[PDB]
Design a protein that fits this description.
The structure is cut from a larger assembly and holds 2 copies of chain A (about 50 residues), 1 copy of chain B (about 350 residues), 1 copy of chain C (about 55 residues), 1 copy of chain D (about 675 residues) and 1 copy of chain E (about 210 residues).
Chain B: H1 32-64, H2 73-85, H3 87-119, H4 136-147, H5 152-164, H6 178-188, H7 199-222, H8 225-228, H9 234-257, H10 259-265, H11 280-289, H12 293-297, H13 300-322
Helix pairs in contact in B: 1-2, 1-3, 1-13, 3-4, 4-7, 5-6, 7-9, 9-13, 10-11
Chain C: E1 3-10, E2 16-22, E3 41-42
Antiparallel strand pairs in C: 1-2
Chain D: H1 4-28, H2 33-61, H3 74-110, H4 118-136, H5 156-159, H6 165-170, H7 177-181, H8 217-220, H9 274-303, H10 317-348, H11 362-396, H12 403-416, H13 432-444, H14 446-458, H15 469-492, H16 494-500, H17 504-528, H18 530-534, H19 540-567, H20 581-611, E1 615-616, H21 628-645, H22 652-660
Helix pairs in contact in D: 2-3, 2-4, 2-20, 3-4, 3-9, 4-9, 9-10, 10-11, 10-12, 11-15, 11-17, 12-14, 14-15, 15-17, 15-19, 17-19, 19-20
The chains are: A mainly beta (about 50), B mainly alpha (about 350), C mainly beta (about 55), D mainly alpha (about 675), E mainly alpha (about 210).
The complex binds cardiolipin (CDL) (4 copies), heme-A (2 copies), 1,2-Distearoyl-sn-glycerophosphoethanolamine (3PE) (2 copies), dinuclear copper ion, calcium ion (CA), copper (II) ion and 1 more.
One 1,2-Distearoyl-sn-glycerophosphoethanolamine sits at the interface of chains E and B.
PDB class: electron transport
Keywords: Mitochondrial, Supercomplex, electron transport
Entry title: Cryo-EM structure of the I-II-III2-IV2 respiratory supercomplex from Tetrahymena thermophila
């Protein structure tokens, strides 16, 4: 997963998987994503954005 | 127009909010007839048990002062049987039963009716715990103050009735019963004879009713997580909450009643002015500012606890059963919950 | 609150002298009761702890 | 005399004028440290109430989903949250400790007539109000002050100047002015409002929609006010829907108390307004701090009594903790100032310090802020440990356990907190090498905290305990600290921190620390120095009520927040999934319980002054029983004092008989 | 001398029992009066009975004495204190005199202002919310549902909802139980909520 | 907790604390075993997930 932001810093958060990725503008952070089960997960952004 | 002050009536325009719930809405059952009926019913039943217990305990003490207390179960059984057949016990039960009817109908009923009137409309939060309980504090305080002095005329009439029985025949009024004494005292000694120096009773009643109704209402909702999430026994939790409520009511009420002992019963120093000038209010202030709590907490159980607490505990259980502490809870995202349904699912 | 005890002791020169035991505080002059009366109550309140600097 | 009544009035005027001069000289123009500290405490109460009010707004909004309080104003909620954080941190705890306690206590604990800079001490106090107002009222104040139902179209056309721009050219070039006047008049010196309501009246070919209040110029001409009354709440139409926007400009918000860039440092997202005021106010607060620790630190170094110049051990623990924190503030204040100044330049001058496009480093802003950020919270807490370390030995009649080790325990935390600022930036994307270093040092910080906990516990054993309200607050402080620190140690768990970052678990963690521990310590000191501050003994009754309700509220308010954090609720969100209704209602309930505790505290102070009774030291002049002779002296006087206090109540025999034969209500007599 | 200020002569002065034996006007500033000393004959006899075999001490038989109230804090004297603090500007040398009486002592004064201090949380919160009407003028008002089809149908939609419930689809949905029963009835030009809806009736349009 | 609340009050059994100053030299090291184990457990569990 390559996380990035268009305008400001956001957070790609999935509490079910326990994954929190900060999408920072101007960066191409690479993360490892491995879901070891069949499931459907929801999420909400976890960084003040506006 | 009618007198110096004018009650100006004004009209206003429409206003509405997003949410129509969790505020103040008067329940349909909150009416003068219904609230008074329920309050009187709960008070009378609680008072009857309270006075019967008080009569039984005092008769047992009276019998024990002349005979050895029970040594085993068999001696206890015969002791109770003898107490029941005592001539004094039967008369005490009859007179105190009348006292219960008057107190439960004019004092406990008034407290419950006023509390329901001022606190029926406080809705609770759906799928949650009622917050902003501070809003209910003024209502309970208003009810407690309003109904505080409704018991003093009866209590003084009770004391006058019993105190008359111990005088010689020449100096004895000769009251037929408590009701006769209550109906005669106003015309003999005057209405103020039933209210003079009533501060100890008034403050006692206020601190009893306020901390009993409010604490039970607060605890019965805030502690509901025990049986709402923990799957605990709801009735057992309510009984425990009622037990806590009555115990606090006794603790906060007894110290103000101790002023009677300090002012009148404590021996007076020869030649020196009275420590409290015969004023109960000043004695209560002294108790309030006294450093050692145990000094004025002595005799809490032997003197006051069992004469008041059993009555208060029953009143809460009876009031809860009839529905004096039941509030209305509705979903805030339901049809009537809010006026904006476009964001209840989106 | 001024002195908590007193004693009379004969020093090596043969003269009897009076020794007084001052009241003390736990490292906190603020808690110390600065008073000039044989009274436990803290009656005197001083705006200037060091009047003469 | 024929004017005896007038003469009495003349005396009253003289008395009032003299009192006015006395009050100004003694409470406004004074430089006395004790008076300044007392004024600091009263200011703290006002700011504390303001912070409490902001907290209440947050809880009411978070009570249940759907924005019951702000009704969709996400921007307004964010401003209120930022105001709550900044006010509580820089204008509640800091004034109480470094403003009231430090000014009141440092002269006592160092032996100085006054601070080294009495002028600066007075200056520091009188500068606080402006910063407090700026950071506290941002929730109320917006650049777009008007509400959504204000018809700004009735006032903006008057403000427009391009309408008369055609006349500007001829005001300087008269050559063709006459030709210009010969044109056709269409809208010169006139306003026409297009129809706002559909009207079908064939009788009239034109309709008037001028504002009603602007109908007649005979009254407008002499009225010295802007034409806003016309547009201010003149229409009954309203829409009570959450999805209806209340602020047209979506950028009129705040980036929290952390100032995250580029959101905080770019007008495209956080437009001009509250954000800029916070930036300058933070720099303003930093300079106020610069005056504060400069005066106090030099006071210790230059005016400390002989024998205490360098022996930090001898001084009371609160003074030791205060001085250490002041040194921390000096080290970290410049870093915050530089970061905040750079934010101001980027917003206005567009220096692109935090713009990645041309070399900016958005993460640099977080580094500089958190470099000061973490030492700040350590600065807030370290002074709190002092209260328990002084109160417990005082009431226990025993020396504190390992005072030297506790001093070094706090010191190691002080100068090792400068290398853990990055645990607030684990997920930002920094290198793993730095990430591991921050985690490793952060967990090691737990050890010195454990040292203090064991020392606190050991100070309660094998002593003469004198239970008092300050002692009870100390026990409540200890109980809250144990959970507070333990939760923080879990946050050091890197894998758990990934899920718990920017969730309510962190919110729960530092509320138990700040709201729980720091405030309990502050209240513990207030009752410990109540006689020294107010000159009268406190009322134990309302004091007990304040302790029980305040302590209870903090637990009920913030313990459920841990459950929300585990559930996965993010932070700074005013509308949340329905599944969080249960615990948020508990959290709101706890806050109201805490507020009830605050009510008792103010009633306690009011009741105490009503009592207005001289206070008596509990030690009776024997703080320590180092020898059996001292113990006997205390026992002899203590028993004598107890007899005098008991001299006015009946003996045991009289009391028992009165209690036994109290009942006098019987039916039959004659035996 | 004035008998109006003498409690013994003037019976209108309400004596404070809690301040018996304490006269703030008689304090010294600095206080240099001794009011406590060894007290005996209360429970411990002053005489000697250590070896008296025929005498046994019974502390339970304690005679009651005069109540000893806790010392009252000093009360300020406005005229005296103001003169004491008063210093002549360009006529007084800037110095501290040797006498310790010049120390500025704190004396408690009027207690009325502390009532506002006790009620400050109530006053402050009331000002913050009620006086400033924050966050709006409708949050703290008693809630009233909108009138029928007010302000517009797109927002209220009472008539369409009423028809939907009364339609075939509405009855089926209520049968499923997912949709709760209708909570209002459209009377002759007015909307009336059922008593079980738990909401006040809509305010009159005037 | 039980001992302090039952006997250490002035009423029951106060103790004459004659100790002037502390003399601990390595109690901190001994006590820090427990938090040390906490750090080891946190590091071990955290790293295994990482
Ligand atoms: C609803 C309001 C809700 C507000 C909620 C607010 C919440 C927040 C704040 C809460 C705290 C508030 C505290 C207030 C200040 C209290 C100060 C204080 O302690 O000292 C006062 C006073 C101290 O007097 P004192 O000089 O020290 O004398 C000491 C003696 O021991 C005792 O004194 P005494 O023996 O010399 O006098 C006893 C008093 C006894 O008075 C009573 O029992 C009446 C109740 C009020 C008594 C309050 C004291 C008197 C105040 C002045 C006059 C009051 C008039 C009546 C009330 C309205 C005006 C306030 O006697 C009289 O004053 C005259 C009695 C006349 C004979 C009886 C006739 C009764 C009327 C019958 C006809 C009309 C009704 C039936 C027919 C209707 C038509 C069909 O103490 C009290 O009387 C009790 C105080 C207890 C304080 C605890 C809280 C309870 C307060 C209850 C009072 C109100 C009862 C309900 C009536 C009002 C609402 C309807
Ligand atoms: C959690 C702790 C963690 C750290 C551990 C540290 C090491 C161990 C603790 C240190 C040693 C403390 C020793 C305490 C017992 C002293 C001896 C005794 O039996 O007491 C009677 C003794 C009076 O006897 P006396 O000298 O013969 O009386 C003659 C004259 O009356 C002179 O009397 P007076 O003028 O002093 O007036 C007394 C009057 C005025 O004093 C009061 O009313 C005190 C009010 C204190 C309020 C705070 C306590 C919590 C209130 C309930 C909240 C609900 C949840 C509670 C549980 C979870 C949270 C702890 O109180 C009474 O009428 C009697 C009070 C009830 C006595 C309780 C008997 C059991 C004591 C053993 C420990 C109990 C632990 C269970 C929880 C507490 C149960 C009470 O009372 C005192 O000296 C005052 C202290 C009483 C106990 C409370 C303090 C300990 C608890 C601290 C909790 C800290 C957190 C608070 C926030 C909670 C928020 C939810
Ligand atoms: C969340 C976790 C919370 C943890 C903490 C709380 C848990 C307990 C912690 C550990 C402490 C307790 C254990 C040790 C002491 C236990 C009690 C004891 O030994 O003393 C006995 C003593 C009885 O008198 P006595 O000492 O044997 O004297 C006899 C003399 O012959 C004649 O007596 P007298 O007339 O001469 O008067 C003597 C009276 C002198 O007067 C006093 O001293 C009374 C005032 C005491 C201080 C009050 C404030 C402090 C306590 C409350 C705040 C802290 C606890 C918070 C609890 C939160 C809820 C969990 O002396 C005393 O009572 C003083 C000593 C005992 C009380 C104070 C020390 C213990 C703390 C209180 C325990 C009871 C709590 C009840 C529930 C509390 C709910 C808030 O106390 C009791 O038995 C009262 C407690 C039991 C009441 C049961 C009934 C309550 C409901 C009413 C029902 C009405 C009838 C209908 C029945 C229906 C059934 C289905
Ligand atoms: C039957 C049901 C009950 C009905 C209730 C009716 C009354 C209302 C409720 C009051 C509360 C009662 C509950 C008990 C609480 C306990 C305290 C208590 O009341 O004890 C008795 C209390 C005893 O007073 P104390 O403080 O212990 O000492 C008095 C001795 O004279 C001291 O002797 P001294 O020679 O040592 O001192 C002389 C003078 C020394 O002079 C100075 O130090 C001068 C200070 C600088 C000049 C400015 C003074 C005037 C401005 C007020 C202060 C502003 C700064 C503080 C900020 C907060 C202000 C609230 O002393 C003062 O400091 C006196 C001024 C005190 C100012 C503090 C605030 C008083 C008002 C309390 C709240 C109630 C009114 C609310 C509305 C108005 C709020 C302002 O006596 C009273 O009953 C006085 C009630 C309060 C004052 C009257 C307020 C009436 C306002 C009407 C509107 C304005 C008209 C006048 C202006 C000119 C014409 C337009
Ligand atoms: C006074 C304030 C204060 C104090 C003292 C602390 C102290 C500590 N803090 Fe905290 N922290 C904050 C205020 C504070 N913090 C704030 C405000 C934030 C968020 C800022 C923002 O983003 O807005 C934060 C955020 C924060 C994070 C980031 C979480 C995230 O964003 O994902 C971390 C990560 O490790 C952390 C760790 C710690 C640690 C290890 C301590 C250590 O100092 C604690 C050491 C003490 C112990 C570890 C106690 C040991 C326990 C016992 C002896 C009792 C044991 C008993 C039982 C287990 C029953 N804190
Ligand atoms: C000292 C710091 C401090 C204190 C005491 C508090 C106290 C409280 N806080 Fe706050 N809070 C923060 C610092 C503090 N907070 C910070 C830094 C943030 C992060 C903001 C962000 O990231 O944007 C935050 C965020 C925050 C949120 C998150 C909002 C969101 O993200 O959407 C919430 C939610 O309820 C909240 C609630 C509360 C409550 C109910 C209290 C209650 O404890 C309040 C009760 C009142 C008091 C505790 C003080 C009362 C004062 C007095 C009585 C005067 C005393 C005077 C003397 C003793 C002289 N706080
Ligand atoms: C620590 C202190 C604060 C504690 C938390 C308080 C939170 C709310 C703010 C209240 C501040 C004042 C204290 C009042 C407490 C009791 C009344 C109360 O809480 O009011 C709430 C309630 C209305 O609220 P409700 O409608 O239930 O809200 C949900 C609606 N969907 O209203 C009612 O129940 C009706 C009450 C009527 C009487 C209220 C009188 C308040 C007076 C306050 C002081 C005003 C000072 C003004 C100064 C002016 C100076 C020029
Ligand atoms: C509510 C949280 C916020 C308030 C402050 C919390 C402080 C926490 C301090 C730690 C010690 C207290 C214990 C923890 C809090 C109480 C229990 C709780 O939070 O409720 C959850 C729990 C059931 O949760 P769970 O098992 O997950 O249910 C899933 C259902 N599918 O519920 C249960 O199993 C019920 C257990 C109730 C115990 C209450 C004890 C505290 C209250 C005062 C003492 C009450 C004494 C009388 C109890 C009578 C019970 C019949
Ligand atoms: Cu995107 Cu928060
Ligand atoms: Ca919400
Ligand atoms: Cu940190
Ligand atoms: Mg983040």
């Amino acid at each position: 997963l390559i996380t990035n932001s268009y305008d400001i810093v956001h957070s790609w958060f999935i509490p079910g998987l326990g994954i929190k990725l900060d999408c920072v503008p101007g960066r191409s952070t690479h993360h490892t994503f491995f879901i070891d089960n069949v499931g459907f997960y929801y999420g909400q952004c976890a960084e003040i954005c506006g | 127009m009618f007198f110096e002050l004018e009650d100006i009536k004004r009209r206003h325009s429409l206003y509405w909010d997003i949410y129509n719930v969790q505020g103040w809405v008067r329940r349909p059952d909150s009416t003068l007839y219904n609230n008074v009926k329920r309050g009187v019913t709960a008070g009378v039943v609680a008072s009857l048990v309270q006075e019967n217990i008080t009569a039984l305990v005092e008769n047992c003490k009276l019998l024990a002062t002349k005979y050895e207390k029970p040594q085993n179960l068999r001696q206890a059984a015969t002791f109770m049987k003898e107490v029941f057949k005592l001539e004094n016990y039967r008369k005490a039960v009859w007179n105190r039963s009348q006292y219960a009817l008057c107190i439960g109908t004019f004092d406990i009923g008034a407290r419950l009716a006023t509390f329901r009137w001022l606190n029926n409309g406080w809705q609770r939060v759906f799928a949650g715990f009622e917050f902003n309980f501070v809003r209910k504090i003024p209502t309970t305080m208003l009810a407690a103050l309003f109904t505080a002095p409704f018991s003093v005329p009866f209590e003084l009439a009770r004391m006058a009735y019993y105190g008359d029985k111990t005088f010689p025949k020449e100096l004895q009024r000769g009251y037929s019963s408590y009701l006769s004494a209550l109906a005669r005292i106003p015309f003999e000694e005057g209405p103020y004879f039933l209210f003079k120096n009533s501060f100890p009773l008034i403050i006692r009643n206020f601190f009893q009713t306020f901390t009993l109704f409010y604490t039970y209402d607060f605890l019965k909702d805030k502690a509901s997580f025990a049986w709402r999430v923990g799957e605990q026994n709801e009735y057992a939790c309510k009984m425990i909450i009622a037990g806590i409520s009555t115990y606090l009511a006794a603790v906060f009420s007894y110290p103000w009643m101790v002023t009677r002992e300090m002012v009148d019963f404590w021996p007076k120093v020869p030649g020196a002015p009275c420590t409290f000038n015969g004023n109960y209010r000043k004695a209560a202030v002294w108790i309030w500012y006294h450093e050692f709590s145990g000094n004025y907490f002595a005799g809490f159980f032997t003197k006051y606890f069992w004469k008041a607490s059993p009555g208060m505990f029953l009143t809460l259980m009876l009031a809860d059963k009839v529905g004096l502490f039941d509030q209305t809870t509705v979903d805030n995202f339901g049809g009537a919950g809010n006026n904006s349904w476009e964001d209840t699912f989106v | 609150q001024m002195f908590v005890a007193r004693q009379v002791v004969t020093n090596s020169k043969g003269e009897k002298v009076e020794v007084l035991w001052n009241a003390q505080c736990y490292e906190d002059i603020a808690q110390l009761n600065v008073g000039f009366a044989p009274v436990l109550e803290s009656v005197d309140y001083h705006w200037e702890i060091f009047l003469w600097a | 005399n024929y004017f005896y009544y007038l003469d009495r009035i003349k005396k009253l005027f003289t008395y009032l004028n003299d009192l006015r001069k006395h009050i100004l000289k003694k409470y406004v123009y004074t430089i006395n440290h004790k008076r300044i500290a007392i004024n600091y405490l009263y200011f703290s109460m006002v700011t504390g109430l303001s912070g409490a009010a902001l907290a209440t707004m947050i809880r009411l909004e978070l009570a249940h989903p759907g924005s019951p309080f702000f009704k969709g104003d996400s921007l307004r909620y964010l401003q209120v949250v930022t105001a709550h954080g900044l006010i509580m941190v820089f204008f509640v705890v800091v004034p109480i400790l470094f403003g009231g306690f430090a000014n009141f206590l440092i002269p006592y604990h160092v032996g100085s007539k006054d601070v080294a800079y009495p002028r600066l001490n007075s200056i520091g106090f009188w500068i606080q109000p402006c910063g407090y107002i700026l950071l506290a009222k941002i929730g109320f104040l917006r650049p777009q002050f008007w509400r959504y139902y204000d018809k700004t179209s009735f006032s903006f056309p008057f403000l427009e100047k391009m309408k008369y721009n055609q006349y500007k050219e001829y005001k300087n070039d008269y050559l063709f002015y006459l030709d210009f006047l010969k044109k056709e008049i269409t809208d010169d010196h006139s306003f026409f409002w297009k129809a706002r309501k559909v009207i079908k009246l064939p009788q009239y070919s034109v309709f008037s929609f001028v504002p009603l209040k602007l109908m007649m110029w005979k009254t407008m001409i002499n009225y010295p006010e802007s034409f806003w009354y016309a547009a201010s709440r003149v229409v009954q139409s309203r829409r009570k829907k959450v999805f209806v926007t209340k602020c047209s400009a979506r950028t009129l918000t705040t980036a929290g108390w952390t100032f995250i860039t580029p959101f905080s440092s770019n007008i495209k997202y956080t437009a001009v307004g509250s954000q800029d005021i916070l930036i300058l106010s933070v720099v303003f607060a930093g300079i106020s701090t610069t005056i504060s620790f400069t005066n106090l630190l030099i006071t210790r170094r230059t005016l400390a009594m002989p024998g205490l110049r360098h022996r930090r051990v001898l001084m009371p623990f609160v003074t030791i903790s205060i001085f250490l924190t002041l040194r921390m503030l000096a080290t970290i204040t410049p870093v915050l100032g530089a970061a905040v100044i750079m934010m101001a330049f980027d917003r206005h001058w567009q220096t692109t310090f935090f713009e990645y496009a041309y070399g900016g480093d958005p993460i640099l802003s977080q580094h500089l802020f958190w470099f000061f950020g973490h030492p700040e919270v350590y600065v807030l807490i370290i002074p709190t440990f002092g209260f328990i370390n002084m109160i417990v030995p005082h009431n226990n009649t025993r020396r504190v356990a390992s005072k030297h080790h506790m001093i070094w325990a706090i010191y190691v935390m002080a100068y090792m907190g400068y290398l853990v600022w990055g645990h607030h930036m684990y997920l930002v994307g920094l290198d793993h090498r730095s990430r591991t270093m921050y985690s490793t040092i952060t967990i090691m910080i737990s050890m010195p905290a454990t040292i203090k906990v064991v020392n606190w516990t050991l100070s309660l054993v094998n002593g003469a305990l004198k239970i008092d309200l300050p002692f009870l607050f100390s026990m409540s402080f200890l109980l809250l600290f144990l959970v507070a620190g333990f939760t923080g140690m879990w946050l050091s768990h890197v894998s758990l921190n990934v899920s718990m970052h920017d969730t309510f678990y962190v919110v729960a963690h530092f509320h138990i620390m700040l709201s729980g521990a720091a405030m309990t310590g502050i209240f513990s000191g207030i009752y410990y120095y109540f006689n020294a501050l107010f000159g009268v003994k406190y009322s134990r009754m309302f004091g007990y009520m304040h302790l029980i309700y305040y302590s209870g509220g903090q637990w009920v308010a913030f313990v459920p927040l841990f459950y929300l954090g585990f559930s996965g609720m993010p932070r700074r969100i005013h509308d949340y999934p329905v599944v969080f209704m249960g615990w948020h209602s508990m959290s709101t309930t706890g806050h109201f319980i805490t507020l009830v505790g605050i009510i008792f505290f103010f009633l306690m102070m009011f009741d105490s002054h009503i009592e207005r009774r001289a206070s008596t030291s509990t030690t009776l002049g024997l703080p320590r029983w180092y020898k059996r002779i001292s113990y006997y002296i205390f026992k002899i006087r203590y028993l004598q004092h107890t007899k005098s206090k008991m001299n006015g109540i009946p003996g045991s025999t009289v009391r028992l008989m009165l209690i036994n034969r109290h009942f006098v209500e019987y039916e039959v007599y004659e035996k | 001398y004035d008998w109006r200020d003498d409690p013994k002569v003037n019976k209108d002065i309400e004596e404070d029992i809690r301040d018996r034996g304490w006269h703030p006007e008689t304090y010294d500033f600095p206080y240099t009066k001794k009011h406590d000393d060894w007290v005996f004959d209360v429970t411990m006899p002053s005489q000697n009975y250590q070896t008296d075999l025929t005498v046994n001490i019974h502390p339970e038989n304690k005679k009651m004495h005069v109540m000893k109230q806790v010392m009252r804090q000093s009360y300020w004297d406005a005229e005296h204190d103001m003169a004491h603090e008063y210093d002549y500007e360009s006529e007084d040398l800037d110095f501290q005199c040797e006498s310790f009486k010049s120390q500025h002592f704190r004396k408690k004064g009027p207690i009325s202002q502390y009532l506002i201090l006790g009620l400050l949380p109530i006053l402050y919160f009331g000002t913050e919310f009620f006086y400033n009407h924050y966050p709006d003028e409708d949050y703290w008002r008693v809630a009233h549902p909108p009138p029928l089809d007010y302000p517009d149908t797109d927002d209220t939609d009472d008539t369409e909802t009423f028809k939907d419930y009364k339609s075939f689809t509405g009855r089926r949905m209520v049968d499923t139980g997912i949709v709760d029963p209708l909570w209002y009835d459209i009377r002759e030009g007015k909307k009336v909520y059922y008593d079980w809806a738990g909401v006040n009736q809509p305010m009159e349009d005037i | 907790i039980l001992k302090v609340a039952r006997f250490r009050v002035l009423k029951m059994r106060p103790k004459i604390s004659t100790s002037y100053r502390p003399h601990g030299k390595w109690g901190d090291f001994l006590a820090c075993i427990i938090p040390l184990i906490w750090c080891i457990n946190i590091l071990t569990n955290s790293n295994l997930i990482l």
